[PDB]
Design an enzyme around this catalytic site. Sequence first.
Site, short mmCIF file in Angstrom:
data_model
loop_
_atom_site.label_atom_id
_atom_site.label_comp_id
_atom_site.label_asym_id
_atom_site.label_seq_id
_atom_site.Cartn_x
_atom_site.Cartn_y
_atom_site.Cartn_z
CG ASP A 12 -18.45 -12.28 -2.24
OD1 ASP A 12 -18.67 -11.20 -1.42
OD2 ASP A 12 -18.01 -13.07 -1.49
CE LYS A 64 -12.13 -8.91 4.91
NZ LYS A 64 -14.09 -9.22 4.36
NE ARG A 195 -14.96 -19.18 -2.29
CZ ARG A 195 -13.46 -19.45 -1.93
NH1 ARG A 195 -12.46 -19.82 -3.05
NH2 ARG A 195 -13.15 -19.01 -0.12
#
Lengths: 217, 218
Positions: A12, A64, A195
């Site tokens: 991301d 999504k 992350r």
Amino acid sequence: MDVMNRLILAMDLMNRDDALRVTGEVREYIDTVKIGYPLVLSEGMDIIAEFRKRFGCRIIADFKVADIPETNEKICRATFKAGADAIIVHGFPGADSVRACLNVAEEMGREVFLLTEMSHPGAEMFIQGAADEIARMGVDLGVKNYVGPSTRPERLSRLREIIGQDSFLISPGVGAQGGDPGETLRFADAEIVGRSIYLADNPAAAAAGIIESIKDL
Amino acid sequence: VMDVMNRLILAMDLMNRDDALRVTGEVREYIDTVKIGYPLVLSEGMDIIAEFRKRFGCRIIADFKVADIPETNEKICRATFKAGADAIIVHGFPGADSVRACLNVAEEMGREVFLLTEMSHPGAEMFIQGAADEIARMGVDLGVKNYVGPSTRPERLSRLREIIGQDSFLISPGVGAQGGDPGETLRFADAEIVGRSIYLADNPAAAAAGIIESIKDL
Ligand SMILES: O=c1cc(O)n([C@@H]2O[C@H](COP(=O)(O)O)[C@@H](O)[C@H]2O)c(=O)[nH]1
Ligand SMILES: O=c1cc(O)n([C@@H]2O[C@H](COP(=O)(O)O)[C@@H](O)[C@H]2O)c(=O)[nH]1
């Protein structure tokens, strides 16, 4: 689906240079990358082919998908044209919307992952109360691949119960959101980590550390 | 609220640049507000927003049905506004934190969030419909000013209007191809969204003009 080290990288980062560098740094540990809208909307759909060229990894498009059937079909077509191996679809919009995605995936030789309960606190408001029924809907529709939350192992375990041991289950929320790598793999085939790896001081060491903690899994 | 010409928003879901540009240009005298979604964006890139702005006068609503965790929602909104979208459409079903993340970015970046409450397709009855009144109420509590609700269910569209109040801005898809009526929809919505009835027509300008003529008194 053979996912190396049962670990899927959620890439991301939002610029191409960083995303490619960090993915390259952890490539020895991971052969499956989840690419979502943060990277795609920042750098374009051509990034998917670039990842295949450079890393020869599997690509899950985490989009999504949550539109009407007609639009879902178009989204899936555009996504698979870009070279994604699989796409993540919301179940909350109902069976017709999921079926639209299943149809395109069959036509193009790809997989649909059905997202049933989400990992963040807001999921408790509406999604959680529908999640078991969404999972049964997946079973009724012939869905074989599912996504459920690392942050609620009791809910992840229930999802596994509904779909059975034959179905494939991946799970985000490990690390940053509080999910534990080892506990998640009691129930999921593979876990998703973003992350804790890509924002780590040393992403390679972070990935290595996670795998070390689940070594006997 | 945004001043939508003729209370009519084009859903531009064609998937190649040339056709999308041709059709949008053809209806420019009737429509100044264009909804661009993922069918076009994933086919042609976020620079399609730039191209539409450059070519036409039009406001751009990015119909991305944002439906992720708060952290990812923030990133999606940032990328979308950076590209020049005036507004973005966000799902309410993932809950309040996910909506708030989008509102926060919109506030910081000087843009707008539209909250999608109930959807227009049959599958919406399974899970979304039962949550929709609460999702709308949640939007009001969070300070959401712009909403999306279904033309295909006038009774539900009417209730959503009640919940959000007359001051909120409400747009509504499902007109034409999905069976919603142009006039009936505008009893409750500020503007109607129309895709296939216009963009698949032999003469998109005539199709748009025809829809408008049928709601001239409104
Ligand atoms: O319920 C869900 C479904 C998701 O796909 N995801 C996603 O999986 C990833 C989690 O990344 P991270 O490890 O940085 O928290 C993100 O890309 C995010 O959008 C999530 O966190 N929870
Ligand atoms: O409840 C909803 C929300 C939407 O955004 N939309 C969307 O509005 C459009 C409807 O287009 P059409 O007029 O061709 O049926 C599409 O872009 C679609 O994705 C929908 O039809 N129903």
